[PDB]
Amino acid sequence: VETFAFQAEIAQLMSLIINTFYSNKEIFLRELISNSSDALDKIRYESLTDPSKLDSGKELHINLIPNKQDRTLTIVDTGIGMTKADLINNLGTIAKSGTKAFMEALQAGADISMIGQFGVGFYSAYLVAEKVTVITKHNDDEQYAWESSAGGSFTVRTDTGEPMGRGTKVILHLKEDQTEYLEERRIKEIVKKHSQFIGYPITLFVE
């Protein structure tokens, strides 16, 4: 298990998300589904010239898996997946510059819901999650698990869990007061409101 420090700017972003009074937390799901869509677009694009890229899984989709016993909401996609380097480099984002822009926008009157416009939507997960685990598999790398409960550090390890063919799984370990996001009707509402034009099947698992 390797432990890394967040860049100061990203730690600042995370504290802002965790500490700011802001009621419209539901947008985290839109942001994660958008990320999944982007990753699915990437593997589809690659497959247009090299169909063997889909040998690790032909179906391009997004699954939403609530588990009330574990208090987790898991978002699974069969997108391109991230390499170990992607994970370490802020989950494939340019988060330092994105955070700078986001901060400046907030000071000018923007609100947290606009986070995705700055390319750092992943971190909105911390609106509702006390811990986030990201399991990922790219065609050109091994399966890795990234994890952070904020507090300035994240870990990366090779994943010995259930193998995924290809793609990314974001496991949200929800805060005690945010269990509404495990309820079918609430999740359905959010998907319908914010993700109407995502061009991949979004399947909400039931329990």
Ligand SMILES: Oc1ccc2c(-c3cc(Br)c(O)cc3O)noc2c1
């Ligand atoms: O260059 C990239 C950037 C992000 C992702 C992702 C990804 C990252 C997050 Br974070 C997420 O929530 C969902 C994803 O599919 N999978 O593969 C990628 C490749």
